[PDB]
């Protein structure tokens, strides 16, 4: 039973261990100690909930306009342990990640790079969430693949953490 936490820095070793087991994105341990030590509030992680530690099961890292211009939000990488998916998990760990990405820092437009080649992502990621497209960047991925951009406007009241 996945619990949806607020992501701590303790969970960088166990976070990045998942976006690597389950993803073709090799990332360093700096580029986690600055997502979660610049804008640590709006990047969420969620996995295992046992009482009477925890196991990583799925996470969500979300940086802002790192590079230089009206307060733009981004989302770096997202994944989940297979034997856990299709049970929300992914599908409502982001309705909070946006629902803080315009509450704390207050940024008006999300953004990202989803491959596809891809069902899971380029579906409840433009039909559930609604997130147009913008530039379809070709070979912008490290496999000769071409991957959708995805913009996603966010105006507070029209995306709260309890519409379900």
């Amino acid at each position: 039973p996945i619990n949806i936490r607020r992501a701590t820095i303790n969970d960088i070793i166990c976070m990045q261990n998942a976006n690597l087991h389950n993803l073709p994105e090799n990332y360093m341990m700096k580029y986690y100690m600055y997502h979660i030590l610049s804008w640590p509030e709006a990047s969420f992680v969620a996995t295992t909930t046992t009482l009477d530690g925890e196991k990583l099961v799925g996470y969500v890292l979300v940086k802002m306009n790192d590079d230089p211009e009206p307060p733009n939000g981004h989302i770096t990488s997202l994944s989940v342990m297979r034997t856990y998916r299709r049970m929300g998990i992914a599908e409502n760990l982001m309705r909070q990640a946006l629902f803080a990405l315009r509450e704390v820092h207050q940024a008006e437009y999300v953004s990202l790079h989803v491959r596809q080649s891809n069902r899971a992502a380029l579906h409840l990621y433009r039909d559930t969430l609604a997130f147009e497209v913008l530039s379809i960047e070709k070979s912008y991925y490290q496999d000769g693949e071409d991957a959708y951009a995805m913009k996603k406007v966010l105006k507070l009241e029209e995306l709260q953490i309890s519409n379900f």
Binding site: Y27, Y31, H74, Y140, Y141
Partner: peptide
């Protein structure tokens, strides 16, 4: 899945 190579 932001690409730090490219």
């Amino acid at each position: 899945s932001y690409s730090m190579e490219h």
